[PDB]
Amino acid sequence: ELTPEERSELKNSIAEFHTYQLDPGSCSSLHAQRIHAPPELVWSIVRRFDKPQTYKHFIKSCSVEQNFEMRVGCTRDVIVISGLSANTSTERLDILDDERRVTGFSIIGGEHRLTNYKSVTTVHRFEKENRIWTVVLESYVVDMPEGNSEDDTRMFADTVVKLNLQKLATVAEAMAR
Amino acid sequence: TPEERSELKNSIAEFHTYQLDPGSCSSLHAQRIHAPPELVWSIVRRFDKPQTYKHFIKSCSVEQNFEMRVGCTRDVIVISGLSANTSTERLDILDDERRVTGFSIIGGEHRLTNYKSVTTVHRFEKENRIWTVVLESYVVDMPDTRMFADTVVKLNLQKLATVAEAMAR
Ligand SMILES: O=S(=O)(NCc1ccccn1)c1ccc(Br)c2ccccc12
């Protein structure tokens, strides 16, 4: 859990990249992760649009186009493990900024229930005297689905984001170690 | 550590060693937890409340006259987002003296047939400090699914550590 000082530092960034204009029947979350590791090492991992399996769980495969150029606008085709109710996810790059260290994607297809899913990730340096760590921020907006709460999966999406941010931290940290 | 490893060999031999069937596969995992063993043990012994240290648990239902005894079962419904749906699990072993427990799935709406598991809590005192090493093994029939079971076990062990470390502090 971020410290009050950490929180204050990120206020501006949250307003810039992680503030969404919601549609009626949609919602938004925001998570945070502290990583004892250099920021630019963490970005290298995060920016790899063609390789999410590196920091995300449950990914069986991730394929892209052959003459693939990782610019905004390009897509990826994720296949998720069997054991998750989801099958295939077509995901589009929305933002990449090696400068500001911001990235983001939107789901534009695939056999799943969530519609109009869209998330944004940002990386942040924290120099305090002796040392240097990172804080990552991952927000997302997704429609409020129609049907009984039997089947609402917004809680899952949420702990997925959380689980992946833990793996990212683990992965990023064992590279500095 | 190579040293932690040396002390658990025996326990692996007694509790985490399986007689495979043709088509099944076994696996072992370890987790270092900064917290006392009795604290850890006291969480993982709670058969009626696995959600306390596991991910993805919609519900867990036992029974109102539930006494915690080998043979007893529990009904678990998974969060939504996961294919398999509900599962029936029975307590295979409970030993508060050697701190060992285990269960096997005996029903449910899924693919993991003949899934069986064992968990052990181990003590480790070093310079002054006192930590814990947990071991979890499992066996399952194989016909994509071993991958998911393995991922789950690791995650759950990671939640256990989080939860137990949070309780000590
Ligand atoms: O029912 S369980 O409590 N079994 C315990 C357990 C632990 C590890 C792997 C499989 N099983 C359970 C927890 C979490 C998940 Br995901 C499960 C998914 C399918 C079936 C059961 C699941």
Ligand SMILES: O=S(=O)(NCc1ccccn1)c1cccc2ccccc12
């Ligand atoms: O395909 S994903 O890698 N997309 C990224 C992502 C992450 C969290 C929530 C949704 N989307 C993915 C992984 C795990 C669960 C998912 C369930 C539905 C759709 C995609 C899933």
Ligand SMILES: [Cl-]
């Ligand atoms: Cl994984």
Ligand code: NA
């Ligand atoms: Na589901």
